[PDB]
């Protein structure tokens, strides 16, 4: 899924990763939280909130 950050977000944990308002993410998985997506950025992969991004699968 083409994930696009609507806002600037700094992770809160080691499992999560940061993005700046406008990053292009790569959603590799989603199979639990209807609040956290496991996407890819900056040579890393982690959890990101669905309310801080505009989804386009």
């Amino acid at each position: 899924m083409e994930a696009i950050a609507k806002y600037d977000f700094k992770a809160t944990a080691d499992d999560e990763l940061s993005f700046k308002r406008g990053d292009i993410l790569k959603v590799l998985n989603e199979e639990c939280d209807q609040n956290w997506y496991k996407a890819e950025l900056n040579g890393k992969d982690g959890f990101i909130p669905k309310n801080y991004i505009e989804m386009k699968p």
């Binding site: 639990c32 939280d33 609040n35 959890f47 909130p49 309310n51 801080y52």
Partner: peptide, 10 residues
């Protein structure tokens, strides 16, 4: 002012 982030604990 970005949204209130969800509680990341299921």
């Amino acid at each position: 002012v970005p949204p209130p982030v969800p509680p990341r604990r299921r």
